[model samples]
Target: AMEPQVTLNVTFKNEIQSFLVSDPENTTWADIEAMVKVSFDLNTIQIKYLDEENEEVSINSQGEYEEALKMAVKQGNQLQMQVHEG
Candidate 1:
């Protein structure tokens, strides 16, 4: 079996970025927050992705993270997520 990884293409107000999650199973929501915080230098952020119907789905928890991965897999592993700063 192939290694499980998620390539998150995150867009911010200042720039567009990419975060490679090498280990999905062990990764936590805090882990994702930490990565974005370093770059954005903000405490509040919201992560979202565009679904098949062009609807934006929010990822606010561990389960949502997993759901997003599944969504990406369904769409050929090209997940396009956006990060909002408040």
Candidate 2:
């Protein structure tokens, strides 16, 4: 069995910003959910993923990080991405 590949690509706002990442294939949305709960008082985040075709995917989610996971499950074979919050 081939494990799903994970990659990170982000266009930064400033060029000096630190962010966190999560593995979609290895970890469940619940994991991200918990991380976000304690990491920051983040109200919302933009989650992205890719289809089998490897195109840009987008999701509008709030609360914890699982919002991204929810988007992936609902959207399809989602590849995670990074976006500048600043």
The model with the greatest lDDT is 1
* Candidate 1 residue runs with Cα over 4 Å from true position: 1-3
User: In model 2, which runs have C-alpha deviations exceeding 4 angstroms?
Assistant: 2-5, 15-24, 30-42, 50-55, 59-80, 84-86
lDDT of 2 by residue, 1-86 (tens): 32333333333343322224434546555454344433443445544445446765564434333444444455543435544242
lDDT of every predicted structure (CA atoms): 0.79, 0.43
For residue 28, model 2's alpha carbon misses the true position, in angstroms, by 1.6
